[PDB]
Design a protein around this ligand. Structure first.
Ligand SMILES: Cc1cc2nc3c(=O)[nH]c(=O)nc-3n(C[C@H](O)[C@H](O)[C@H](O)COP(=O)(O)OP(=O)(O)OC[C@H]3O[C@@H](n4cnc5c(N)ncnc54)[C@H](O)[C@@H]3O)c2cc1C
Ligand SMILES: Cc1cc2nc3c(=O)[nH]c(=O)nc-3n(C[C@H](O)[C@H](O)[C@H](O)COP(=O)(O)OP(=O)(O)OC[C@H]3O[C@@H](n4cnc5c(N)ncnc54)[C@H](O)[C@@H]3O)c2cc1C
Ligand SMILES: COC1=C(OC)C(=O)C(CC=C(C)C)=C(C)C1=O
Ligand SMILES: COC1=C(OC)C(=O)C(CC=C(C)C)=C(C)C1=O
Ligand SMILES: COC1=C(OC)C(=O)C(CC=C(C)C)=C(C)C1=O
Ligand SMILES: *[C-]#N*
Ligand SMILES: *[C-]#N*
Lengths: 407, 405
């Protein structure tokens, strides 16, 4: 069997980041990354791509260009995990064994669980910022919008970046005002959830925006079907089972249902729900002491964000080094996550919070305010630091900045 | 091989539907895929675990309940390919169908609790949810001398949501009738925030809880069993990272549960892995010749055999009218029932619908503890199950409810 001291499953934000940190610890020849995609995406910018403010081409780089040099890139899909034998299977009919496994397989998008998708995306007026194949269709629908309902959905599943489904609603609202057709747009957010956001400080701030800008939110309302040829969408009422509503749209942004990656769903490393079953504080697997998880694929009970990945990557770096010494981990993940809620083409409400779902803001000022500074950070500083700092293992989230500020 | 109606699963829903479908398309045109040699009436495991009934009586040979003339394919489903109207099995065969009824149940996941199932080889721990462990509930109940008696509820969907606490009420009663009640600290450690989802019955259980000095600890989920040390580890779901290690003298484990593995990644499932069916007709949302019944579906009601019975009458009509090129009209209302055993001779018969509101069959108050309902649960229901429901003649008690009203 081909063998690596440290085997990383997934070449996304978590997997590249952990690979760069592990390269420094065990040497690059002792690390391998399993990743099928030729391309690596900074997904946060898709929100601005869907709104016409950033180019899709700049959101991605070749996977080979972010593989830390000297690390082995195994271009394949993981098909099975056998942690009892310290090995995995890939779709090139090979088995790979490891001394330590880092699972960073992300979250899976399930558009086809919505009847009529993804085939409906072949028609006009419907987009989705969650897919490289559909984010530019969001922007086209926004551009070609003339009159009617502009509908934004939120599924009945876990999601990555819980705020992105409404960010693009605020961007669309601003676009209608900028282009003089706000009065022709009836803007509807149909969310499966019961609240606009999970942290009260920012939910309150978004609700004031919902009122001022005349937006409709229908709660516990889940998209179950698109008829793209007819510009109709069907929403089930999760409160009254069986009752469904058909409604026409001039623009539909679909947030797809999401789930653990198919290979993890049935795997021994998953919990009963299919997520990688890790310690909430150290990110070491609950049952396989040489396995670890980071990012969207884990059952860490916090928002699934790249910012959470960065904070986790700092903890997991420490966890692995002390597991390598047969010592007991002491540094603990606090659940840090961040959600830069884009509310317009030049404003962000920078939500930051931890496992307690309470504000944990980095800067000395009140981040529940719409801020230009926070927009420029999200739109222009964050991509640069992602490619040149986080992916190279030099970003563990802003806790040090927060402590350095409150000083 | 090809069948007009292929049924996946020979449990409560699949047998019931195969019998109903035999009478529509001919026995020679129905097949059941099912690996187990034994078919169990699971509701009685609650009483086996309390020592009130025998395990042997709860199972019969699967061949015994297969409708005569219906092909029993003794195998496991391993893939569903609804776009080609076929499934695959673990003896490497392809079976095609005109109509497909999915009744694969719910899957028990004991091994997601660290220390299980190997911890069951030690004394003082049982689980009514498995044929391999329900008699160990009863052994644990009998050998209990003094300490904590712990009853758990996982952080997943479950079948028979009431059974995790039914066995606590029975154990409480068993402790009094054998003198050691004062020696037992009885606690219910549940992942949920309420004792039951339907307010009428929740309130009735709440006073039983108060009056019998039971402790309910909300948002506490069992994550590890240290069986040789008699310790149970709970995570606090309100404070991520916080745990509690508790000693037990008896532990009853309600396992984490999930959709059957073959359904998790299948095209017929929704994003969560449940069979994705229309909430009123039980026809699949995306494959019009696919249908689902029972625990494996995403029908947003309590997962019970009583729900299966009510679903089987609706599913029966849905498929018949579809075969006749008509649009289904009769709607499932979410009917389910929970016969909450509260002692060795009482039952609180909870009945409710999609609205989580009481929908009681009988004209008296079912939120009271009743011996009639106990005797119905313990003696009438199993007779009705083997000889009426499994033969396709029980679609739930809606007609009785109207009679008595
Ligand atoms: C529209 C949008 C906006 C967002 N905005 C923000 C934001 O403002 N801030 C923020 O912090 N986060 C944001 N995010 C979230 C951020 O993109 C993710 O949380 C982050 O990428 C998670 O990293 P990950 O490593 O867990 O997964 P990913 O980066 O998604 O990588 C997972 C990798 O696993 C690979 N993989 C999958 N299955 C297999 C398999 N079987 N075998 C091998 N490899 C496999 C995939 O190819 C992928 O490369 C946004 C996301 C979206 C979609
Ligand atoms: C302890 C306990 C007490 C209960 N008490 C009550 C009660 O009082 N009242 C009530 O209404 N309900 C009660 N129930 C619930 C009741 O048992 C179930 O809701 C009912 O059995 C559901 O029927 P089903 O057909 O969906 O699943 P099951 O009856 O479990 O049948 C599923 C079948 O699928 C088969 N199968 C699984 N995977 C595959 C595969 N890959 N290929 C082929 N076949 C497969 C299994 O072998 C099994 O035979 C109780 C359950 C338990 C565990
Ligand atoms: C239920 O969703 C909605 C709200 O709550 C988030 C609103 O506040 C508003 C504006 C509300 C008030 C009370 C002025 C609308 C129109 C709405 O649809
Ligand atoms: C792009 O993903 C993100 C991060 O990872 C690179 C962050 O660290 C952070 C937090 C950084 C600061 C300066 C608060 C945010 C907000 C974010 O969106
Ligand atoms: C055994 O499973 C059960 C049924 O299916 C056979 C029921 O119909 C019913 C409802 C039947 C009546 C007469 C209320 C209950 C309570 C039940 O537990
Ligand atoms: C939040 N994203
Ligand atoms: C409820 N059973």
């Amino acid at each position: 069997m081909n063998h690596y001291e440290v085997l990383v499953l997934g070449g996304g934000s978590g997997g590249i980041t952990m690979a760069a940190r592990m390269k420094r610890k065990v040497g690059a020849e002792n690390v391998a990354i399993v990743e099928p995609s030729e391309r690596h995406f900074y997904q946060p910018i898709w929100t601005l791509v869907g709104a016409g403010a950033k180019q899709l081409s700049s959101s991605g780089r070749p996977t080979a260009s972010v593989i830390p040099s000297g690390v082995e890139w195994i271009k394949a899909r993981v098909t099975e995990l056998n942690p009892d034998k310290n090995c995995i299977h890939t779709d090139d009919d090979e088995k790979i064994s490891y001394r330590y496994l880092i699972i960073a397989l992300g979250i899976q998008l399930d558009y086809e669980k919505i009847k009529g998708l993804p085939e409906g995306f072949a028609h006009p007026k419907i987009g989705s910022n969650y897919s490289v194949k559909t984010v530019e269709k969001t922007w086209k629908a926004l551009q070609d919008f003339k009159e009617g309902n502009a509908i934004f959905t939120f599924p009945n599943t876990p999601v990555k970046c819980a705020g992105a489904p409404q960010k693009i609603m605020y961007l669309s609202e601003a676009y209608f005002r900028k282009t003089g057709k706000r009065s022709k747009a009836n803007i509807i957010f149909n969310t499966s959830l019961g609240a606009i956001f999970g942290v009260k400080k920012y939910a309150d701030a978004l609700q004031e925006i919902i009122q001022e800008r005349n937006l409709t939110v229908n709660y516990k309302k889940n998209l179950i079907e698109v008829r793209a040829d007819k510009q109709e969408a069907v929403f089930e009422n999760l409160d009254k089972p069986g009752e469904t509503q058909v409604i026409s749209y001039e623009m539909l942004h679909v947030t797809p249902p999401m789930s653990p990656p198919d290979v993890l769903k049935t795997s021994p490393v998953a919990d009963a729900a299919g997520w990688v079953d890790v310690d909430k504080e150290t990110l070491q697997h609950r049952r396989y002491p040489n396995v670890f998880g980071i990012g969207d694929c884990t059952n860490l009970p916090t928002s699934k964000t790249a910012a959470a990945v960065a904070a986790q990557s700092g903890i997991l770096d420490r966890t692995i080094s002390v597991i390598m010494k047969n010592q007991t981990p002491t540094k603990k993940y606090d659940g840090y996550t961040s959600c830069p809620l884009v509310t317009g083409y030049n404003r962000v409400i920078l939500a930051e919070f931890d496992y307690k779902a309470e504000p944990l803001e980095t800067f000395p000022f009140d981040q529940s305010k719409e801020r230009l500074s926070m927009y420029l950070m999200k739109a222009d500083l964050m991509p640069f630091l992602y490619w040149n700092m986080m992916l190279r293992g030099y970003w563990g989230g802003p806790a040090f900045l927060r402590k350095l500020f409150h000083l």
